[PDB]
Symmetry: D5
Subunit: 196 residues, 10 copies
C-alpha cells in the first residue's frame, strides 16, 4: 500500500501539525517509538464525513492513551485551515476543541507514502494505519470517501495486537477483550482452542 | 494504492480454480460477480490457526451477506486439493468442515500480488479483505497482520453503509450503523440536516 | 521562462474548480476568457495574513478592471471548501466575506506549477500575478516573496499601458501613467516626438 | 521558477564585464554585492525606445536606492562598446548620456538565460527586474513585455516593504507604502492589531 | 542447463523449512549434506495422485539409499502445514502416513525455479529429480511430466553407477547394473579390457 | 527448463544432416516426425567409451520402440563423416558397426545448445535424452553426466507409461510397468479404485 | 568549418539586416541565387579593425557588383546598433553611410553555422566566405581579432573562380586577371603551361 | 571552427614523415616549431596542376618567410616516395624539382582531418593554409577550392600584420601593409590616433 | 572473415577510378567482371620496392590469366596521377613502364578496408590478393606482410584448381597441378578412385 | 584483418588438446612456440577428401620445416579421439596413418573463429594457413575454399623469403626463391643494386 507494508517500518515523516493547545509544531513519527500510533488520513477540512471521524477519534483519545497508544490525524490542508476548523462550532460543521494533533500534509508526500493519495483530486482517501512501538506497520484500513471508519473496530484491533505481543498467542475472527486466544501450533491449537 | 487495487478503480480481475461448496472444482472470474457486491478475503495458509476461524466465520454468516446482494469469496495460495482436504477435516480438529462459500486456489500467487497483500519472503497472503461493488469497483480495503483476525460484523457495517450511500446519495458518519441518519454532502444541507441536529 | 509561463507565449491552460462569487462551485478554464484581458493571481494559503488583504483588494476593485475589459481571478492550493468557509468568515476576524471574483482551488497544485510559482518544499504558491491578453498571451509577470503584498494600482497602470500600446502602436516609457504620451518605436519619430522634448 | 531564478533561493551568480559609471570597463560579479540589497534589471537592446527611459530613470534615482543600502545594476545583451557609445550619445537624441549605475554586457546571453528572461528567437532579454537581498537571495520578480516600461516608484515601495518586514518581523498587506502599519503574521495578533481595525 | 541446475556445477543452494520424519519443522540446507550423496526430488501437489505414490516409494526405500551414503529429500510448493496434514492422513485414503524422509515446503517456489522445474502457469513443480554428489555437484537430472511417476530402481541404479565411477575411475556402459564391470576411459584399455571381451 | 527444452512445450526444432541406417547422408527435421513418438538422445563424442555402448543398445532395441509408434534418433557434435567411419568400425574395436537408427551430425552444436545439454567448456553434449510425443511436445527429460550410461529399459517403461496415460486417461504411479493398474486422477475415484486397495 | 564546407551549400539563413537606405529588412541567402556573394563577419560594432573592414568593403562594393557579386556584412550586434554606427562620423570611429547591408545575427546562429563564433566572448571571428551563384561555398578566410582582411585579395579570388567557371581551366598560385590558366589534364598542362 | 583548428586554440599537433629538402625522410612534429611562426599548407595531390605551382611558389620564397622567423611546411595525402619522385621530376614537365621546404606525407589523412580541410568523398585535402605563431596557437585560416591557387604575397602580408600586432600591442586595419600605421584598440586612443587622422 | 571479404560470399563491391593500360582514367566496377574470374591484388605504395616487381610480374603474365577467362586488377591507396607517373618511369629506374593491366586508385582506402588489408597506422594495404569467380564470389585469400612478394605461379595454380573443381565437380588435393587428377568428394568414390590408387 | 588474426599483430592465442605424433593427447599452447617459426593450418573435417592429402603432405615434409626453425601444427574442429582413429586408418583407405605433426582438436571452434576461418553455417574451418614468426607475430595469411588444396612448396618459399628478409635486411620481390637476390628497400640502393640490372 504505497510504501506502507505490513511488518515493515511505517513510512517516516516529519511535518507541521496543529496541536491540542492550538499551536503549530513539527511532529515526527520516530518520536513515537515506544508507543502504539493510530495514524488516520481524511480528505478535506470543512467537509462531511471528515469532521465526524476527527471528532470521534479526539473525543475517544483517552481510550487509546490508556493502551500506550497515541492518535494522529492528517489531511492535505494547511495548519491554518486546521486551526480555523477547530475555531468553528461543531453545530456548524466545525471540529471545536481538539484533543489530538492534526498533520498538515501540504506537500501531500505523507499520504503518497501511505499509498492513499487520490492524485486526480489531490486528496487522501480515508486510510487508517496501526503502528507498533517498534515503528512497524501492523494494520491497514482504507475507506472510499463517503463511508466513515469505526472507533470501536480500531480499539478492538489494538487490544488484539497487544494481546498477541503479551501472550504469544493469536486472535481468532471476531475477538474482543477477554475472549480466549490460541497458540499458533498444530497440537496446542487443537488441545487449547479447536476441541472446545 | 494497495498493489493494483486502488479505491475507485476496477478491482484487479482474475479467473482461478476454486473449491465450490459442493466439493467440486470450478473456475471463478471476478467479472462473473457483476451486478452484485463481493466480499473477497485472503488468508495465509490452510491448516493453520486464525485462518480457519475466519473462513468458518464468514461461511457461517454468508446468508447475511447474500440477503444484502453480496457474495463471499475466500482465497489463499494453497491448492484446490488442500482446500478440499481442509473441508473434509472436522472443525474440532482445526478443519473447515463443509463450506458455504467458494475458496480460490491462488497457486501462482498472482491474485494476492495484484491485490498487494502478498508477503514475498514467505509466499503467503496477508489478511487482506476487499469490498467490491456491483460495477466491479473496489470500495474498501482491510489488511491485517497474520496473528489478528478480522471482524465479520464490521464487514457487514461497511457493506450497509456503502449500500446506503448508493441509495440515498448521502454519506455515512464515523461509526454509522443501520438505522442511523446519513448526511447530505453539501455545505448548508449538512449543517441544516445533521450538524445542527446534534 | 517562469515554469511554462513565457512572455508572448500562450498562458498555460487549466480547467479547475473555483468558488464562484455567488458561493457555488464551478469548473473554470482559462480559454473561457478569450476575448478579455485576464489578471490571474496566486497566493499561498487561505486563513493567513497578507493573502486576505490581497484577495479583498482585488475583489473590491474588480469593476475598475471590468471597466477595461479585464477579468480578475484568484488562485491558491486550498480546496473550494476552504475558500467557502473563508468567505463566510468576517473580514474583521481575518476572512474575505462575500467575494466579487472567483477563486480557483488548485488542489493538485499543477496550476501553480505550470506558472512556475510553486514553493515545492511548502506545497504553496508564491505571490505570482500574470497579465494575460484577449488572445490568451502572457504579457506580464510579478512574483513577490511571502511577506510582501502586491499593488492593485501598479497592476492597473500596467493594464492601461498595455491597452494604450495595442490601441496606438506606441510604447510606454518607464513610469508611464494614463494621460502621459507614448513613444513611436521608430528611430526618427522617437527622437522628434519624444526624446528631444 | 524563472529560469534558475527561484524566490528564496540564491540569485543565479554571474561574473561579467560592465560599463562602469566613470566610463571604464570592469568585471562585476553578483557576489560582490553581498551585504547589500541589489536591484538587477535587464532590458532588450541599446539604442531603442522604452529601454533608454528605464536606464535613465533608475540611474537618475540611484541615490534613493543607495539611501536604503541597495545598489542598482543594469543589463542587456549588447557589448560594453555599444553601452559606451550609448552613454556618449545625447539624451535628446535617444542616448543615456553619463550613467550613475553600471551596465552589464551580457554578450553570451547566459545571464538573461539563467534569469529566465531571454526571448530566444530574438536573442534579447525581456524587461526582467530582480530584487535580491544582502544574503544574495532572490525576493521579487517583475517581467514586462517589450513595449511597457517598469516603475521606479513601485520598485522602491517593494524595497521599503522588504526592509520593513526584515526589521520588524511583520508582513506588509496589499498596497502597503512607507508609513503604513504592518501585520504580525500570527493568527491572534493579526486580528487584534490589524483585521479588527 | 536446467534453470540454474547444470551438470558438474554446484547444485542450486537453498535453506528452507521442512517437515521432518518426527513431524517437527526444521530449516534444512543443502550445504548440510556435503559429504553424502543426495537425491532431491520435486513433485507438483500434496493431496493428489502420482505424488503420494512417489513420496511413499522413496520413503519406504530410504535405507537402500542410506546404505550407499545417500540421503533423500522430497519437495513441493505446499506449506509445511499441508505436509503435516498429509502425513496424518491414511495411506489407504491417499495420505502419506509416517514418513522416513524430510519434505521441503518450497513456499516461494524459488527452489523449484532454481532447479528449472516450476510450471509457471499453474505454480507447481514437474517431477524433477536430481542426484547431487558429496561435493555438492549435480550429476544427474530426471524430469517427468505430471501423469507419469518415476522409478526408484533406476535412481538406485544410477546412484551405484556413479559411486562405481568415483571408486574405480572407470565409466559405466548403457544398462550398467550393480556387479557389472565398467571400462577404462582410454582408447587402448577400452578395447583390450572391454570392447574385445564381448 | 532445459535450455529451450521445457516439459509440455514443443521440443526445440532442428533440421540437420544425419547418417542413415543405409549409410547415406540425409537432412532430418524433427517436424518430419509428427504423428510419431520420438526418443532423441545425445552423446558427447564418437570413438569414445560409454557412447558406443549406448548408440548400440538403442539401435539393437529399435524394433521395440518402432512397435510403440516411436522413432529413435541419436545425436552428437561429430560430423556425418565421422559417424560413417564409426559404423564401419568393428564393435570389438570400439565401433558401432552398421546401425538401425539415424545419427544426427550436430556440427554447429545449436541442437545440443537448444536442448540445454552442451558442455560449453569442451563443446560436447551431455547424455541428454528427450521423449517427444506425436504432437512435438516434450514429455520427459533425462540427463546423465559423461561417465554413466542411460537405461534402454527405463526409456521403454516411460513410453509405455505415457501411452497408457493417453489411452486410458489415468495416471502412472511410481515404478509403474506394463500390466500394472493406473489410477484415475480424481479425489474419490483415486481412493475407491487405488488407495483403498493398498 | 562549422557547417560550412567547400563545395557544399553555404549554410542558409534569413535574418534582419540594416540596408543601405537606413531601413530594416529580412535578407535570406537563397535570395542571392544567380549571383556571387561575399559574406564577411566581424566581431563588434563600435570597435577597431571592424570599421576599417566594413568601410573598405562598402566603399569598394562596385568592384564586386561589376562581377555579378553582392556583398553582405554580419555581426552579432542588433540592427539598431548598426544604425547608430552608420549615424556616427567616420572620423569618430563610425561607419557613416553604407553601400552594403549588415546582418544583425542577434541569436548568433549564423556565425555558429559558419563555424566562426568565439563562444566564450559570444562574438564572430573575422570570417569571410565566397559563395557562388548556385549557393555553393568555394572559399574560406578567417582572421584572428586584430588583423584585418584584404579587399584586393578577395577580388583576386573572385576573378580566379570566375575564370575557372568560364574557361574550364585552373588558376595557379598568385594568379591575377590576365595571367594564363592551365588545363587540369596531364598532357595539356605540360603542353600549355608547364613547358613555358 | 575548422575541424579541430580553432583560432586562438593550439594548432592540432602531429608527428609525421616528411620529405626533407635534402631528399631524405624524417619525422616532423608541430611542437618542434615552438619559438617560430609556421605557415602550414595542404594541397590535394602530387603530380597534378595548381598544386606544384603552389609548392614551388612557397619554396622559392622561403627565404622571405625565414627572415621573419617563419617556417614553411607543405602537406598532402601522398606518400614520401611520391613526394621524392615529384622532386626528381623537372618543373617543365610538371615536377617540383629540388625543394627548399619539407613536405609531410599525411598517409593516414588524419593531419588533414584534424585541420578540417579533407574532402572525404575523394580522400584529398582542400587548399587549406594555416598560420601558426611561436606559442603554437592558430592565428589564421585560408581554405581554397581545388581549382584556385593561393597567394604568397597575401600570406606575407598577414604574417607581418600578426608580428606587428604582437610587437606594438596595436591592431591592423583592413588592407594593412608593412609601414602602414596600426591603431591602439582603445576607444579614445583609436579616435585620437587613427580615425581623426583620416 | 577478412574484413568484409568472406569466402563463398560476394566479394566487396566497388566502383573506382583506375589507370587503364592505355594510360587513360576510367571508373571500374567489380560487377562489370561478372562472367569472368578476377584476380584483385593490393600493394602498399607506388614508387617503392616489392610493389613494382609484383605489378610488373602480373602485367607481364596477363595473357596466362586471360587464357583461363581471368582478369587481373591491381590496387593501391595512391592517386591515379601517381599511377600514371609510375607507368612513365623506366623499369630500370624502379618504374612500371607500360602496363597490361588496370590499376585502381583507392584514394579513400575503403576498398582496402572492405577487403580487410589496410594497415591503419600507416594507411597502406598489405599485399592482399583475392580470387573472385564468375559469379562474384570470393574463393581465395592470400595476404603477405610488406617485405615478401607474392607468387604468380601459385596464383595460376590456384586459378586452375578452381576451374578444374567447377568443371568436373571434383576436389583438388594438396599440391595439385594442371594435369593432375582430382577426387570425387564422396566416401566410396574417393577410396576406389583416389586413395587406393597411390 | 582475418577475424582477430591481423598481419604484424600477435597471432591469436590458444591452448588446446592435440593428438601428438606419438599417439598421446597433450595440451598445446601457441605461446609454447615462441622462439620458433610456426605454420598453423586448419582443415574442415577428419575423414574427408582434400584434408588428409594436406595433413599428410605437411607431415611428410615436416623435417624441411624443422630445418628452418619452424614447427607445423594442424587443426580441425574434430575431437582428439577422431584424430587418433584417423591416424589408425590406412592411407589407402583415406586415412592419415601415423603422423609426424600434432593435430589440434578445436572442439569449441574458438580457435578457428579467432583466426577468421570458421564457416558458421556448417561449423567447420576453411583452409586457413598462418605463418607466425618467433615473436608470435602473424606474417602471412592463406585461406582456400573447401575444394582446393594448399601448396607445401609455396609455404616453404614464403618461410625462406621471410627468413631472408630478417637476416639480410632486404626485401623479396615477386616470385623470389632461395638463391635469388633481395633488394635494399631504399630509393637509390634499390635502383643501383636491383632495378638497373633488369
Ligand atoms: Cl491480559
Ligand atoms: Cl434503506
Ligand atoms: Cl484613450
Ligand atoms: Cl522605520
Ligand atoms: Cl493398454
Ligand atoms: Cl575572360
Ligand atoms: Cl616594426
Ligand atoms: Cl642466407
Amino acid at each position: 500500500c504505497g510504501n506502507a507494508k505490513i511488518n515493515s517500518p511505517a513510512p517516516s515523516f516529519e511535518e507541521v501539525a496543529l496541536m491540542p493547545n492550538g499551536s503549530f509544531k513539527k511532529i515526527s513519527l520516530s518520536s513515537y517509538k515506544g508507543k502504539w500510533v493510530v495514524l488516520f488520513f481524511y480528505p478535506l477540512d470543512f467537509t462531511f464525513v471528515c469532521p465526524t471521524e476527527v471528532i470521534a477519534f479526539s473525543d475517544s483519545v483517552s481510550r487509546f492513551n490508556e493502551l500506550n497508544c497515541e492518535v494522529l490525524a492528517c489531511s492535505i490542508d494547511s495548519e491554518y485551515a486546521h486551526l480555523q476548523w477547530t475555531l468553528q462550532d461543531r453545530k456548524k460543521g466545525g471540529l471545536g476543541t481538539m484533543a489530538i494533533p492534526i498533520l498538515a500534509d501540504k506537500t501531500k508526500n505523507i499520504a503518497r507514502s501511505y499509498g492513499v493519495l487520490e492524485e486526480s483530486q489531490g486528496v487522501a482517501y480515508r486510510g487508517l494505519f496501526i503502528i507498533d512501538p517498534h515503528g512497524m506497520l501492523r494494520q491497514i484500513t482504507v475507506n472510499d470517501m463517503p463511508v466513515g471508519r469505526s472507533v470501536e473496530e480500531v480499539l478492538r484491533l489494538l487490544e488484539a495486537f497487544q494481546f498477541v505481543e503479551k501472550h504469544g498467542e493469536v486472535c481468532p475472527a471476531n475477538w474482543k477483550k477477554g475472549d480466549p486466544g490460541m497458540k499458533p501450533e498444530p497440537n496446542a491449537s487443537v488441545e487449547g482452542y479447536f476441541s472446545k
